[PDB]
Design a protein around this ligand. Structure first.
Ligand SMILES: OC[C@H]1O[C@@H](O[C@H]2[C@H](O)[C@@H](O)[C@H](O[C@H]3[C@H](O)[C@@H](O)[C@H](O)O[C@@H]3CO)O[C@@H]2CO)[C@H](O)[C@@H](O)[C@@H]1O
Ligand SMILES: [Ca+2]
Ligand SMILES: [Ca+2]
Length: 131
């Protein structure tokens, strides 16, 4: 049911953030120092959506104090697919997976993430079928 897993650090463009080592399962890196206005683009790795309809988007996140939120969209800002609040997890390297649904059109997508409020780290994103 997995369409794509995208490691958050594997962006083709970004604004305002920096990579750091993660102690989450699998190791590697996460994106940190996320604040309002910051963004991540995955335009360099287009993802194919096989059919129009509902998809589940998952985010592997960590947050010391909570208060964060993001917008999932096409790279460049539009169309916007959805928004999600990012809860406190207990620490900067205490990880949990959050999710929401969005509608996506069939075909090739270039995704982006805009931080509306900071306070969180991001390890990876996953796009899944519902259907
Ligand atoms: O959706 C996230 C944010 O996107 C920002 O636009 C950027 C795109 O995400 C990014 O992919 C694009 O990259 C260009 C690159 O600048 C150019 O050198 C190359 O030839 O083509 C790439 C596109 O394939 O850059 C833009 C901004 O310059 C929005 O600015 C932001 O609002 C939005 O949240
Ligand atoms: Ca920042
Ligand atoms: Ca990662």
């Amino acid at each position: 049911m997995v369409i794509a897993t995208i490691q958050a650090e594997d962006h083709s463009q970004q604004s305002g953030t920096q990579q750091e080592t993660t102690t989450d399962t699998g190791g590697g890196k996460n994106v940190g120092y996320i604040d309002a206005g910051d963004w991540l683009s995955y335009a360099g790795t287009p993802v194919n959506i096989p059919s129009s309809g509902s998809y589940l988007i998952e985010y592997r996140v960590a947050s010391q104090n909570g208060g964060g939120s993001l917008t999932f969209e096409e790279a460049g800002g539009a169309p916007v697919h959805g928004t999600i609040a990012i809860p406190a997890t207990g620490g900067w390297q205490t990880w949990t997976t959050i999710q929401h649904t969005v509608n996506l059109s069939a075909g090739s997508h270039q995704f982006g993430i805009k931080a509306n409020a900071g306070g969180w780290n991001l390890n990876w994103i996953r796009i899944n079928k519902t259907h």
